Amino acid sequence: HLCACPLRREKGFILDGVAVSTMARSYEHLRPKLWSAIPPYNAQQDCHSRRYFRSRVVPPILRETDQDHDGWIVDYFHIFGQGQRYLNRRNWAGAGHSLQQVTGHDHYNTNLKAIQNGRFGYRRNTPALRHCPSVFGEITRF
Amino acid sequence: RGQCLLYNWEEERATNYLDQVPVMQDGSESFFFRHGHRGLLTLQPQSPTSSCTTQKDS
Amino acid sequence: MREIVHLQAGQCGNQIGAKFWEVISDEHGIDPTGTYHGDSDLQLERINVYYNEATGGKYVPRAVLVDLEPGTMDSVRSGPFGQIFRPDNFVFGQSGAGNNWAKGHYTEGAELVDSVLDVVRKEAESCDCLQGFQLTHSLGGGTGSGMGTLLISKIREEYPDRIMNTFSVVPSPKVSDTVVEPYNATLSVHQLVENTDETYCIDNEALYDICFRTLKLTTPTYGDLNHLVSATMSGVTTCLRFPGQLNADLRKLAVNMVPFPRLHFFMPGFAPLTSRGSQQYRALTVPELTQQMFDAKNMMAACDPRHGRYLTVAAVFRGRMSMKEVDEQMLNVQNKNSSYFVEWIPNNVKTAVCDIPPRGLKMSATFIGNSTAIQELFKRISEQFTAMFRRKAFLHWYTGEGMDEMEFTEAESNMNDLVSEYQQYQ
Amino acid sequence: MREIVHLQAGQCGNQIGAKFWEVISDEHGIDPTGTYHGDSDLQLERINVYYNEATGGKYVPRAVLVDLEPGTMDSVRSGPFGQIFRPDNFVFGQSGAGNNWAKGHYTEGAELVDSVLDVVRKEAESCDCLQGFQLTHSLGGGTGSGMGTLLISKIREEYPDRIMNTFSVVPSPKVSDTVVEPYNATLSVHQLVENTDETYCIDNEALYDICFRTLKLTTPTYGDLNHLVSATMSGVTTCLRFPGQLNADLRKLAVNMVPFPRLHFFMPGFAPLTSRGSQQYRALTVPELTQQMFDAKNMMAACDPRHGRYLTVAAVFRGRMSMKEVDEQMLNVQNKNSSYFVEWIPNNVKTAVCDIPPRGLKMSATFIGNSTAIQELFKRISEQFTAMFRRKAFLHWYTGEGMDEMEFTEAESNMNDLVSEYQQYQD
Amino acid sequence: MRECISIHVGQAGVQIGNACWELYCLEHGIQPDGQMPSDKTIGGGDDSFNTFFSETGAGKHVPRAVFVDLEPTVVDEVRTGTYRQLFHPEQLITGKEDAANNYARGHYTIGKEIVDLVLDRIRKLADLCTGLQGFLIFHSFGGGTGSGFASLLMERLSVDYGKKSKLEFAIYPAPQVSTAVVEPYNSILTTHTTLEHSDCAFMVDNEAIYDICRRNLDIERPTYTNLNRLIGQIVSSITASLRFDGALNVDLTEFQTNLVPYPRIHFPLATYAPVISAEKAYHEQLSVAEITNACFEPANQMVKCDPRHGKYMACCMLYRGDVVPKDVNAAIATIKTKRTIQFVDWCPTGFKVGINYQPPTVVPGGDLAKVQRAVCMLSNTTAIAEAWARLDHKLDLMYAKRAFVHWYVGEGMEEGEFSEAREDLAALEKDYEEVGVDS
Amino acid sequence: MRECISIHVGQAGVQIGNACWELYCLEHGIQPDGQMPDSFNTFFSETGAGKHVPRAVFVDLEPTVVDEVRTGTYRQLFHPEQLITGKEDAANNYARGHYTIGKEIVDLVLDRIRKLADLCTGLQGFLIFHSFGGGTGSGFASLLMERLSVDYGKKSKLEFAIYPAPQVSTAVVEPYNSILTTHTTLEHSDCAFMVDNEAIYDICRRNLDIERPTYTNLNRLIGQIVSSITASLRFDGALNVDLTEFQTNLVPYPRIHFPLATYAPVISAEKAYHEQLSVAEITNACFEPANQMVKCDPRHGKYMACCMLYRGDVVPKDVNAAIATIKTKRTIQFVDWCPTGFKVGINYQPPTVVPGGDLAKVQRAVCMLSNTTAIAEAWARLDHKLDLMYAKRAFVHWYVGEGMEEGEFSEAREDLAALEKDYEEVGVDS
Ligand SMILES: Nc1nc2c(ncn2[C@@H]2O[C@H](COP(=O)(O)OP(=O)(O)OP(=O)(O)O)[C@@H](O)[C@H]2O)c(=O)[nH]1
Ligand SMILES: Nc1nc2c(ncn2[C@@H]2O[C@H](COP(=O)(O)OP(=O)(O)OP(=O)(O)O)[C@@H](O)[C@H]2O)c(=O)[nH]1
Ligand SMILES: Nc1nc2c(ncn2[C@@H]2O[C@H](COP(=O)(O)OP(=O)(O)O)[C@@H](O)[C@H]2O)c(=O)[nH]1
Ligand SMILES: Nc1nc2c(ncn2[C@@H]2O[C@H](COP(=O)(O)OP(=O)(O)O)[C@@H](O)[C@H]2O)c(=O)[nH]1
Ligand SMILES: [Mg+2]
Ligand SMILES: [Mg+2]
């Protein structure tokens, strides 16, 4: 999937915030709230608050509270739901699939077909202008 | 402006009423609209500003 | 309330400031005569930030217009908003700079800086409290590049705790306007790293790209690019003039933006930009502002932050919006593409929400972004500088005015330090 | 958007192009001073196909005028529509060819061919996208038949993507206004068969037959002859310039017209030709137009399609008609006349409908016809070439400019093979 | 909540969309400029326009469609016509040059530069819809753009959305009359790529609607504008249940579940019962019993093929207007007692019904009478296999002596796809032979 | 107030200044009488009766060419004292115009220039019009630009000279005075805009379709070039370029100050309205070597700096988009030590037409000045023409009897040899 072919650090800015707002609209009409746009903050899976969560006296409170490995079915819908599947299917190409939206400002004047009477001048459509392009003469050699 | 359909013909045929040079000698859209075009950011340029704040509506 | 002193230097600075004060006067409902013709009381409750009060219910400028040519004073005085400006704020010499930074800073910018300093001192002593100073200029010239930095140095000498700002039209990537433009740009950036708390880089090729694709208009003048620049010039001082749920001044944005005093170069942008023929079809929502908010074809500097990575991001929002949705959008844009944000700091986006939008626009948003991809501008500038310096080209127009040769080299060293120091945070 | 570039070489091509720029400027509402003066806004929409812009809204044609002798250009510059042409697009020489293929291809067109290349590259690269090169000339002349072929060879070497449109005035059987035409016509049609996409053969005897019985004209002049083929040659490219319910550009009338690249010689016509004293004695309907399409008295080539077949056929309808009436007319003509159509191609008639009738009619059409009965045009030319070759009639006028006899022999070897392939697909 | 997105490809596609979107704008209260009349204010609860129209900020309704064509000659008529302020400027995607009845150009060279733009626009339009559940493809089999570019489009849409349903409405060639000499080539080649990349393929024929217009209506010598309105009517009846309340609402995935038995059988027939003028319907007391019966007659079909010599496999009725289920059941029971209508052995019931509470609408001009009820039957039958039995005869005649192939091999196309498209068609017509065998 | 004062020395000077001041009166409201029926005061000065006198000084040593001005319709426009005439000619002799006859005319010319500058509160430039191959334009103009450097110092003095043509020359001793007027001014000048008569002959032959032009016909186009070089002084524009701009921004070294002038749209009124004169085609018109005012091919050399000035329908976006089109063709060439290369100047005022002139009424005009290393062939040809006739001391005895000596020939020859070595050294990449 690299038909656009920019520099490969491009095509990866994702840049879709209206998609996560248009699929939160699905559960406005639904009564069972399953997929929202805020993901849950599970401190176990979180890579930030592990200092408290690897020290002592934590496993005695984990097994007895039925949390040892704000909702359980919401995680199943967050990582298996049709909203997340649609979100991931449209995120394989980070930027757009077109050359216009992957372009920043470095592809502004790139093609730029130059156009140029004659080629270096010297109109000679008149045959008096072709037998000689100057009544005085021409110098050098080109 | 836009009568022949060559390059960017939709936009100014939809925008003759905003960029009509009145009449003068020469009279291009360079000495006219030198100090700014008309309706660049907002097509309704004279609607009054909203007097609604957060606390004055809640 | 804190009032802001505006300064314009050179032809580019004066032409930008004319359009800027035009759009400020429309946003506050001030006619070209100078009286008040607005509809809301919110427009007059904090008009003292930019406008001094006169007799007769008319409002008088807090702005200084400086150039070495008298020919550009007639151009702004005869402009569409030209009669509003104070006659004592026009400071001007007789002979021009010549796109020479040397006489723009040493020979001819020296006898003129006393008059400008007298004007600034005479008018900023009338403050109750003063926040800082704004300056619009260009680095590829002789007036706004030369004396635009000497002025910054002298106000830094006088008031050190105020907020010096800069909206500088940086030199272009592809086609230049002056051949000695790399010299002036290199010599001006060297004075802009120790004397400005914030500085915005504006490039004309970026604005050309906006006016070609996004605005879709085929014959744009300099007024349209000036309007685009001034849409974000006013977009950073909204919370000083209109109330909101989450205010943010320039000092707060500077504090939340720059982590060290040598990275204060930004990339501005404006959200609700679309063509006139397709304007009434766009459904203005906060996600739709976010979608082309962070798009890098909606930048005013001719770099690409997708190439590098974001040290921080600002977002000043105007209009009716939900507080959950702005944090939702500015957390989604952080969380999805985690390779474009620095990781030695938890969050990068600054949130600011105002609720008085521009006239006729339901919502709007303004961008300030600091990235490590801005090093490509100084890299190219220094490459051209050292290509032009090893042959001693155009040098006698600098050295003959009372200026030594090593002052080029120490500026090159400072800019190279800036280039190599930005690489540490990639 | 799909621009064309008009080329015309020699006296015949110059007069034909002059009449063409009369009629198509009258159609688009172009005043002879170069200003638009019409009624509808649909004429200005697609005016770029044949015209360019200027300063102040003037419309100059994208036509390149060339001949070796300026005896014709200065007559068409001072004519009715002479001041709209670009004054630099006229390019010429001192000494003309004079009914010789040799000089205008090897010694006098060889130093003027770069001139037309200069002008055609300047006009070609300034447009957005090109979709054809139009050439009008004659095959019996010397500065059109020889220089035109060299021009097509030099242009097709540079743009193999685009399409070549040629309107060659093939000589008539009973008429010979140039004695050395079996040499020039053969050498011209040797070079045409390898470079052009579609060739429209026009015979002047068929034009005289049209003005004789079809139009009831007592004084048929050469302007009357030029207007008749100019109507068709402006009716071919209608669908580019006007909206339609079924559009067909030059490429559509090439993909759906030639089954093989060496079989591309066409045979045009134009229906609604009746006398002004015989106009209301017949209604203007689709069956009448389709009958007078396929009638033997209404085509501009002097060949009769009874002794041949029809590989494929195009006909661009133009005006305000229905669709299924057209389908009935172009299905029943294949049903009854099945013995005069090829059987290995299921349908042969390609149809296209525009919605803007010409200025002054209700509904019109235009015939484009690939027939295997066009090989009778080349049988006569091969016979007359062989008659003038054994005695070497005017041959010394051709060797004096850097030629040789094996070029003539290979031109004949191209012609007998083209005729043989047409005959092999006749059965 | 039940959004659908339609894609119109080619001149045939955009001209079908021209007469179809006026019907859509007349089902709801949408003015030709895209506004509400502001005199008929609707309740805030109902969202009948949300299936086809997207609500913008102030009051404007912008349709969910893509008009894409390689030429500018027909879609510039759209934005200079009487509906120019209704469509988005960027939903009208136009190329620069056509394909000229060439599969090679539109699938390999001239269709490949603007496939990215139309993909980006479809993605941008799909980022606003919530319950995306269908795709409508309007193109032409016998064209160059509508056969080549559309094939690339639904070759590339499947890799983007995956299992989403793809219903298509294509103009199949006619046996007697036609338009071009080369459309057998462009019709066999599209059978290879849209067979496995589409879910249900409704096909229409331009000559079968001609006899409907001559015989049912009294519209003599009709143009295309009198033919595209029938396509608008049938396509509105199919998606009628998605926006109007009814007794038996039939969702989009319910159509395919009992319309296709086998994965390679998605080619049903199409018909519309009360196609009648005002004069003839004024004197005719018809009923449910023979608007049900008229759709089973061979002369009322929109593809030239008799169902007399072909087994029915899965019929799907849709009813509009004032319809109670009892006379529908009675009419269906009277279908079961007819001998001349035959059914396959493995289908016990073979009938799907759906009742809607909205009568069909009428347009300014036009010729259709305003009737209370209408029937749109999507009959999946085996008799459509003989429609392919003429097109394959249309191919090998030109394929024997290599005619027009040189226009294909030059533009990025190798010869080896005629010889596999023909074998794909042979396997497809064997697949329909297997299902008709008694066992 | 952005005044500049012009000095016209010699026959070429006065016959160019006549066309120049006719154009200046035409695009202002100034009648030839002087009365009227943006920024005006740069070239004219008000009086108590509404008269607008100019600020130019006409200098020649023979009265046959200024007395024609004194009796025409511009008799009451120019100041009576600002037209300076001698009694007898310099006689095509550099020594006569430098040492014997020009020694006592400078006391009047300097007084007149000082009188001009005392009413000039914003003086920022000098313009000197002369010819390299004359006796007054070679000798007296060299004395003037020697002395103005001492008297006025760091004022910008840019002179518009006429190089002798590479092939044609109306005189014979021209490569003597042309050599001697360069060595004595290379340290006394800032920028030298230079035109040849032969290239303008070719342009008026092939661009304009006229045959047999007159010196006034060339002077119309020459004065139209100068009207576009001081257009930004007089009229407001989006990008003003003053007279002191050119020397900072065009010459890299204080020895080489010789650019070449070029006017892009030159076309007859009968052919103007059949073309498309867009920005993409008029900025390209300054680069094909048939359109240059100096008959030298830039294909040999490499461009050092360029300065393009625009008029009329500018719209600065496609100026950038058309300059960027120049970078993609490899036939154009640039030095490696000037990676930027170009200058952009934009003015709103469209060019005006003269009654009887061969030019058309257009809305876009480009006047481009560029210094190129390809000018080294002009100096090489003048080099060879000097040592072809100095090798046997051809016309030397005329010069040595008029207050000069033999060493001034050899010193000037060595000076131009050093200049040619400089031009050869510049054109090396690395
Ligand atoms: N029913 C119906 N059929 C149409 C309509 N327009 C065109 N067609 C059919 O479409 C077929 C070919 O049209 P296109 O799809 O445009 O063929 P194409 O090669 O794509 O032509 P271009 O679009 O110009 O490239 C014809 O045989 C017509 O029968 C229409 O409006 N209604
Ligand atoms: N293009 C142009 N060249 C001119 C014009 N007038 C004079 N020249 C050139 O300038 C040179 C004038 O030299 P001279 O005839 O000696 O006049 P001079 O320069 O005043 O020198 P003296 O006669 O000694 O005073 C000639 O060689 C001409 O080529 C003019 O009107 N237009
Ligand atoms: N965006 C913008 N840029 C401008 C404007 N006016 C001038 N410039 C830029 O300023 C640069 C030259 O500035 P300059 O004339 O040297 O300013 P000076 O110091 O007063 O001479 C050019 O590159 C222009 O692009 C304007 O109105 N808008
Ligand atoms: N129909 C038509 N044929 C022409 C016209 N002028 C010349 N011809 C044909 O041109 C052929 C002779 O070509 P010729 O005049 O020698 O072309 P040349 O080389 O330009 O002189 C003859 O067969 C004529 O029928 C014209 O105005 N109309
Ligand atoms: Mg089409
Ligand atoms: Mg003299």
What residue owns the CA closest to ligand 4's atom 8? D12
D46 in contact with B, Cβ within 8 Å: yes
Q: Report the distance separating Cα C234 and Cα D287, nearest Å.
A: 72
Query: What is the maximum span of chain D, computed from C-alpha positions, in angstroms?
Result: 62
Q: Report the distance separating Cα D269 and Cα D298, nearest Å.
A: 6
Q: Check if CATH label 1.10.357.10 holds for domain D375-425.
A: no
Residue with tokens 């050699």: A141
Give the contacts of A34 (CB within 8 A, at least 6 positions apart): A27, A73, A74, A77, A81
Nearest to C8 by CA among C80, C83, C60, C85: C85
Give, for D22, the enclosing helix (H) or strand (E): helix D10-28
Domain F260-376: assigned CATH number:
3.30.1330.20
Q: Report the distance separating Cα F13 and Cα F8, nearest Å.
A: 4
Q: Which fold has domain E269-385?
A: 60s Ribosomal Protein L30; Chain: A; (3.30.1330)
The pairing of strands C265-266 and C269-270 is unpaired
Residue with tokens 């010429």: D92
Domains D3-257 and D375-425 equal at CATH topology level: no
Strands (E), C245-348: 265-266, 269-270, 310-319
Q: Report the distance separating Cα E114 and Cα E218, nearest Å.
A: 43
The ranges assigned to domains in chain C are 3-257, 265-374, 375-425
Dig out the tokens for E305 from the structure: 């093929």
Give the contacts of D338 (CB within 8 A, at least 6 positions apart): none
**Residue of chain D whose Cα is closest to the Cα of E222:** D322
DSSP state, residue F165? P
Dihedral angle, C-alpha E119, E125, E130, E132, nearest 10 °: -50
For B4, C96, C112, F156, the CA distances from F123, given in Å and listed in that order, are 51, 11, 18, 10
Q: Do chains A and F touch (3 or more CB pairs under 8 A)?
A: yes
Dig out the tokens for D124 from the structure: 């070609």
Give the CA angle between residues E198, E204, E209 to the nearest 5°.
170
Dig out the tokens for F9 from the structure: 């020395």
Answer whether A139 sits within 8 Å of F201, measured CB to CB. Answer: no
The pairing of strands E5-9 and E135-140 is parallel
Nearest to F17 by CA among F216, F185, F244: F216
Sign of the alpha-carbon torsion through C13, C18, C20, C21: positive
Q: Report the distance separating Cα A105 and Cα A115, nearest Å.
A: 24
DSSP state, residue F366? E
DSSP per-residue letters across A9-24: TSS-----SSHHHHST
For B14, B15, B37, the CA distances from B11, given in Å and listed in that order, are 5, 6, 14
Q: Report the distance separating Cα F310 and Cα E357, nearest Å.
A: 70
Contact E356, E413 (CB under 8 A): no
Q: Report the distance separating Cα F180 and Cα F139, nearest Å.
A: 8
Q: Report the distance separating Cα C5 and Cα D42, nearest Å.
A: 57
Sign of the alpha-carbon torsion through C189, C190, C192, C197: positive
Q: Report the distance separating Cα E168 and Cα E7, nearest Å.
A: 9
The pairing of strands E312-316 and D63-67 is unpaired
DSSP per-residue letters across C62-109: -EEEEES-THHHHHHHTSTTGGGS-GGGEEE-SS---S-HHIIIIISH
Contact D359, D283 (CB under 8 A): no
The pairing of strands E61-63 and E53-55 is antiparallel
Cα separation of the two ends of chain B: 49
Q: Report the distance separating Cα E224 and Cα E228, nearest Å.
A: 6
Q: Look at residue D266 and give its three-state secondary structure.
A: strand
- Strand partners of residue F166: none
- How many whole angstroms from F132 Cα to the centroid of ligand 2? 9
- Strand partners of residue E375: E319
Nearest to F237 by CA among C204, B31, C73, C219: B31
Dig out the tokens for D203 from the structure: 């015979």
Q: Report the distance separating Cα F407 and Cα F402, nearest Å.
A: 14
Q: What are phi and psi of D289, to 5 degrees?
A: -65, -40
Q: Report the distance separating Cα C226 and Cα C265, nearest Å.
A: 20
Q: Look at residue C408 and give its three-state secondary structure.
A: helix
The H-assigned helical ranges of D29-110 are 73-77
- Strand partners of residue C90: C65
DSSP state, residue F173? S
Nearest atom in ligand 2 to the alpha carbon of residue F61 is 25
Answer whether F350 sits within 8 Å of B34, measured CB to CB. Answer: no
Q: Do chains D and C touch (3 or more CB pairs under 8 A)?
A: no
Nearest to C186 by CA among C421, C423, C409: C409
- Strand partners of residue E203: E170
Q: Report the distance separating Cα E110 and Cα E258, nearest Å.
A: 39
DSSP per-residue letters across C26-72: HHTTB-TTS-B--S-SHHHHTGGGTEEE-GGG-EEE-EEEEES-THH
Nearest atom in ligand 3 to the alpha carbon of residue C145 is 19
The pairing of strands D90-92 and D349-354 is unpaired
Buried b (16+ CB within 10 A) or exposed e, D262-284: ebbbbbbbbbbbbeeeeeeeeeb
DSSP state, residue D374? G
Give the contacts of E33 (CB within 8 A, at least 6 positions apart): E85, E86
Contact F292, F262 (CB under 8 A): yes
Buried b (16+ CB within 10 A) or exposed e, A101-111: bbbbbbebbee
Dig out the tokens for E138 from the structure: 């309007």
Residue with tokens 């397709």: C278
Nearest to A22 by CA among C336, E123, C331, C316: E123
Would you say the CB of residue C204 lies under 6 angstroms from ligand 3? yes
Q: Report the distance separating Cα D416 and Cα D410, nearest Å.
A: 10
Sign of the alpha-carbon torsion through D264, D267, D272, D276: positive
Contact D267, D199 (CB under 8 A): no
- How many whole angstroms from E6 Cα to the centroid of ligand 1? 18
Q: Report the distance separating Cα A108 and Cα A103, nearest Å.
A: 8
Give, for D169, the enclosing helix (H) or strand (E): strand D164-169
Contact F292, F166 (CB under 8 A): no
Nearest to C189 by CA among C421, C397, C413: C413
Answer whether E179 sits within 8 Å of D131, measured CB to CB. Answer: no
| F343 CA to centre of own chain | 19
Q: Look at residue E66 and give its three-state secondary structure.
A: strand
Q: Report the distance separating Cα E264 and Cα E199, nearest Å.
A: 9
Contact D95, D112 (CB under 8 A): no
Give the contacts of E162 (CB within 8 A, at least 6 positions apart): A89
Give me the architecture of the D265-374 domain, per CATH: 2-Layer Sandwich (3.30)
B45 in contact with C, Cβ within 8 Å: yes
Q: In one letter, which amino acid is F49? A: A
Residues of chain F with CATH 3.30.1330.20: 260-376
Answer yes or no: is E239 a known binding residue.
no
Nearest to C96 by CA among F348, F156, F253: F156
Residues of A in contact with C290 (CB under 8 A): 17-18
Give the contacts of F69 (CB within 8 A, at least 6 positions apart): F14, F18, F58, F75, F78, F83
Q: Look at residue F60 and give its three-state secondary structure.
A: strand
Nearest atom in ligand 2 to the alpha carbon of residue F90 is 24
Give, for E5, the enclosing helix (H) or strand (E): strand E5-9
Q: Which fold has domain F3-250?
A: Rossmann fold (3.40.50)
Give me the architecture of the E3-259 domain, per CATH: 3-Layer(aba) Sandwich (3.40)
Strands (E), F99-235: 126-129, 157-163, 191-196
Contact E244, E357 (CB under 8 A): yes
Dig out the tokens for C128 from the structure: 């109750």
Q: In one letter, which amino acid is A30? A: L
Nearest Cβ partner of F238 from C100, C181, C222?
A: C222
In angstroms, the separation between the Cα of residue E93 and the nearest Cα of chain B is 12
Answer whether A26 sits within 8 Å of E131, measured CB to CB. Answer: yes
Given the residues F146, F245, F281, F377, select the one marked as catalytic.
F245
Q: Look at residue C233 and give its three-state secondary structure.
A: helix
Q: Report the distance separating Cα C245 and Cα C243, nearest Å.
A: 7
**A with C: how many residue pairs have Cβ under 8 Å apart?**
83
Contact E207, E273 (CB under 8 A): no
Query: What is the maximum span of chain F, computed from C-alpha positions, in angstroms?
Result: 63
Answer whether E120 sits within 8 Å of A100, measured CB to CB. Answer: yes
Dig out the tokens for C176 from the structure: 């230049």
B33 in contact with C, Cβ within 8 Å: yes
Domain D3-257: assigned CATH number:
3.40.50.1440
Contact A37, C328 (CB under 8 A): yes
The pairing of strands E312-316 and E380-381 is antiparallel
DSSP state, residue C213? I
Dig out the tokens for F57 from the structure: 């000084």
In angstroms, the separation between the Cα of residue B16 and the nearest Cα of chain D is 16
Cα separation of the two ends of chain F: 45
Give the up-direction half-sphere exposure of residue D198: CA atoms within 13 A in the CB hemisphere. 28
Residues of E in contact with D243 (CB under 8 A): 73-74, 76-77
Q: In one letter, which amino acid is C319? A: G
Task: Give the length of chain A.
Answer: 142
Q: Report the distance separating Cα C248 and Cα C368, nearest Å.
A: 13
DSSP state, residue F388? H
Burial class (CB in 10 A: 0-12, 13-18, 19+), E55: middle
The pairing of strands E135-140 and E92-94 is unpaired
DSSP per-residue letters across E173-217: PPSS--S-SSHHHHHHHHHHHSSSS-SEEEEEETTHHHHHHHHTS
Identify whether F402 is a catalytic site residue.
Answer: no
Q: Report the distance separating Cα F182 and Cα F161, nearest Å.
A: 11
Give the contacts of A127 (CB within 8 A, at least 6 positions apart): D92, D93, D94
Answer whether A140 sits within 8 Å of F300, measured CB to CB. Answer: yes
Neighbours of D59 (CB within 10 A): 22
Q: Look at residue D354 and give its three-state secondary structure.
A: strand
DSSP per-residue letters across C369-395: EEEGGGHHHHHHHHHHHHHHHTTTTT-
Contact A9, A51 (CB under 8 A): no
Dig out the tokens for F297 from the structure: 């091919």
Strands (E), E350-413: 351-352, 376-377, 380-381
Contact F73, F34 (CB under 8 A): no
DSSP state, residue E439? -
Neighbours of C159 (CB within 10 A): 16
Q: Look at residue E317 and give its three-state secondary structure.
A: coil
Dig out the tokens for F33 from the structure: 């009488």
Question: Which ligand is nearest the CA of F130, by number?
Answer: 2
The H-assigned helical ranges of A36-90 are 59-63, 73-80, 82-89
Q: What are phi and psi of F61, to 5 degrees?
A: -95, -15
| C33 CA to centre of own chain | 27
Contact D149, D109 (CB under 8 A): no
| C91 CA to centre of own chain | 21
Neighbours of F329 (CB within 10 A): 15
